[PDB]
Amino acid sequence: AIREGWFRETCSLWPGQALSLQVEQLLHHRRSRYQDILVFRSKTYGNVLVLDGVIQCTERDEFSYQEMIANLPLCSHPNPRKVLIIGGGDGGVLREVVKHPSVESVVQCEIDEDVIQVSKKFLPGMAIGYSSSKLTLHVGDGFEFMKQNQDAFDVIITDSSDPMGPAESLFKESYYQLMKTALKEDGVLCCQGECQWLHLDLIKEMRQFCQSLFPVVAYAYCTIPTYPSGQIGFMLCSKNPSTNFQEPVQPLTQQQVAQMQLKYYNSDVHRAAFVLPEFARKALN
Amino acid sequence: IREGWFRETCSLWPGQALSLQVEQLLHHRRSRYQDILVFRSKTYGNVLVLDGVIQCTERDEFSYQEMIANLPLCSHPNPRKVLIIGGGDGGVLREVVKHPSVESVVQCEIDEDVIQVSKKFLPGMAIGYSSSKLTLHVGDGFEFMKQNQDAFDVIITDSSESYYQLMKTALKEDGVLCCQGECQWLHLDLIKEMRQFCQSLFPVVAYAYCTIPTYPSGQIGFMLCSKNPSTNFQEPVQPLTQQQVAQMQLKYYNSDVHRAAFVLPEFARKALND
Ligand SMILES: CSC[C@H]1O[C@@H](n2cnc3c(N)ncnc32)[C@H](O)[C@@H]1O
Numbered sequence: 001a002i003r004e005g006w007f008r009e010t011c012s013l014w015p016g017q018a019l020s021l022q023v024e025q026l027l028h029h030r031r032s033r034y035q036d037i038l039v040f041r042s043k044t045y046g047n048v049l050v051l052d053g054v055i056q057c058t059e060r061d062e063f064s065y066q067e068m069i070a071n072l073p074l075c076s077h078p079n080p081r082k083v084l085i086i087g088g089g090d091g092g093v094l095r096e097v098v099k100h101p102s103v104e105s106v107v108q109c110e111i112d113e114d115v116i117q118v119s120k121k122f123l124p125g126m127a128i129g130y131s132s133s134k135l136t137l138h139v140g141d142g143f144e145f146m147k148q149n150q151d152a153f154d155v156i157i158t159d160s161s162d163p164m165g166p167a168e169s170l171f172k173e174s175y176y177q178l179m180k181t182a183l184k185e186d187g188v189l190c191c192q193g194e195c196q197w198l199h200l201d202l203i204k205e206m207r208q209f210c211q212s213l214f215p216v217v218a219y220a221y222c223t224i225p226t227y228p229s230g231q232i233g234f235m236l237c238s239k240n241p242s243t244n245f246q247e248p249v250q251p252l253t254q255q256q257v258a259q260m261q262l263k264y265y266n267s268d269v270h271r272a273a274f275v276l277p278e279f280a281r282k283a284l285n
Numbered sequence: 286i287r288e289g290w291f292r293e294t295c296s297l298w299p300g301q302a303l304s305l306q307v308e309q310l311l312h313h314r315r316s317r318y319q320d321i322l323v324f325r326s327k328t329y330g331n332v333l334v335l336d337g338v339i340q341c342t343e344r345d346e347f348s349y350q351e352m353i354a355n356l357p358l359c360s361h362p363n364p365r366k367v368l369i370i371g372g373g374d375g376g377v378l379r380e381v382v383k384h385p386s387v388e389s390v391v392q393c394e395i396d397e398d399v400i401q402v403s404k405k406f407l408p409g410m411a412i413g414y415s416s417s418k419l420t421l422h423v424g425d426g427f428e429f430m431k432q433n434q435d436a437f438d439v440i441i442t443d444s445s446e447s448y449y450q451l452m453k454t455a456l457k458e459d460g461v462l463c464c465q466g467e468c469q470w471l472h473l474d475l476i477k478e479m480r481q482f483c484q485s486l487f488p489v490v491a492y493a494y495c496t497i498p499t500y501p502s503g504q505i506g507f508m509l510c511s512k513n514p515s516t517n518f519q520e521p522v523q524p525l526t527q528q529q530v531a532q533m534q535l536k537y538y539n540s541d542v543h544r545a546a547f548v549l550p551e552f553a554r555k556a557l558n559d
């Protein structure tokens with residue numbers, strides 16, 4: 001997996017291209033009940049978590065994805081108090097969500113407790129999320145878990161890997177209907193929604209399906225060097241027909257941005273995140 | 286190229302690399318100026334590489350080519366005389382000549398063999414060279430710039446500090462320029478110093494960026510400078526209708542994308558503004 005001092009990420013979901021990162025030190029590699037877990041210290045990106053050969057995060061750039069997937073839904077809800085995170089093993093999304101004063105309770109449903117233990121050791125700037133008194137930590141498959149909940153959450157975030165391995169269930173279309181049922185009457189959701197330069201077919205499919213369930217459906221994206229093609233997007237759905245995802249109902253002041261130690265997200269970034277290249281705008285609209 | 290893959294490494298982006306899977310090597314020769322490599326990739330179509338750095342792929346060249354031309358052109362009320370420096374593949378030329386306002390495009394390219402390789406292996410880009418608006422010039426664009434004064438409405442540097450002053454002199458009184466401008470995820474300190482340098486020469490300086498999978502870190506920026514102190518780079522002075530975007534066959538650029546392109550991640554906004 002590491003060859004001549006480099007880790008190369010290949011996957012059928014982005015054929016013919018690969019990011020490599022230069023390795024200073026192998027830190028972990030063990031198989032859990034669910035997936036292969038590899039952690040290494042990279043030369044230029046800090047520590048790197050890899051699950052079944054796909055890069056999950058690096059300490060250098062994790063902040064863009066973590067801040068965006070949390071703040072896109074939270075700042076699009078006028079009063080989000082109860083939050084569900086599915087996945088989120090590294091704790092980074094949790095870290096971001098709990099910064100919001102309005103959030104009282106964060107339930108996290110993670111399938112693989114080994115990812116949590118590895119992240120507490122090797123991703124300390126992300127796994128700081130686990131020290132929050134707002135956390136209820138839950139174990140199991142998010143798909144089956146979702147069934148347990150009705151009219152319960154203001155915001156659901158699905159912080160998953162790609163549609164392979166244990167995350168495959170989180171990309172079933174019934175999962176979106178399960179989240180709709182789980183959400184309160186005016187709830188919102190934000191899911192890792194893949195890359196517009198790689199997966200436009202899937203993005204257009206997800207969007208058409210969600211449009212038949214929700215009065216408001218949007219796609220936003222962030223840049224992040226160490227995901228395939230250097231960016232990834234977010235499927236956003238609201239049960240509230242008045243939700244305008246493009247214009248944050250909770251705009252953050254610069255004071256809040258500073259206090260929240262944000263390195264990527266702010267209110268204009270939020271707005272611009274919905275402005276897609278013409279080829280993607282055309283295909284989705 | 287090793288074991289069916291081309292891997293791009295460079296000390297300007299240490300410890301990271303894009304590899305592209307190779308279907309067929311097409312061309313590999315050293316010109317008088319640089320090493321020229323062209324291959325058919327498995328998934329990005331043909332790929333041009335100069336001294337081991339990826340210049341373009343047929344799959345995603347449209348993003349950078351559309352942005353570097355339209356950012357300055359749509360930020361000028363009537364750009365008639367245009368100068369492109371570099372631009373060997375022809376693709377920026379292809380985008381500039383779409384504008385009816387443009388009467389002449391001078392292109393100054395140092396390496397005539399890039400032009401010949403691009404006409405063979407990058408036909409979607411080298412189509413630019415069929416324009417009647419073209420005046421093709423040969424040589425170093427730096428020394429070339431010294432030849433011109435008060436001549437161009439728009440200068441685009443499509444490249445593989447004193448140069449910026451030369452461009453200022455070459456531009457007309459209200460001229461604008463756009464240069465390839467560094468990745469904000471790789472060299473934010475350099476964007477900062479270049480911006481400060483440019484602010485000492487020009488009344489209006491901005492930084493914009495586009496996404497493009499096959500440049501380092503998946504994006505690249507643009508330095509924009511204007512001699513017109515009223516220029517607003519962020520809000521295009523020539524907005525495009527949907528009809529126009531359709532007619533120009535744009536696949537990345539439109540007027541909203543233009544505006545969004547100046548909205549930077551907080552770390553970069555902070556470093557360039559605060
Ligand atoms: C690293 S953040 C992504 C996380 O999603 C977790 N995950 C994958 N599949 C599921 C699932 N079906 N339910 C809950 N969490 C999951 C993975 O174990 C990983 O920690």
Ligand SMILES: CSC[C@H]1O[C@@H](n2cnc3c(N)ncnc32)[C@H](O)[C@@H]1O
Pocket residue numbers: 340370371372373374393394395396399424425426427443444445
């Ligand atoms: C491929 S587009 C970039 C182009 O810039 C050209 N180039 C590099 N250096 C110079 C220079 N000093 N003057 C003009 N063109 C240049 C390269 O030869 C290439 O064709």
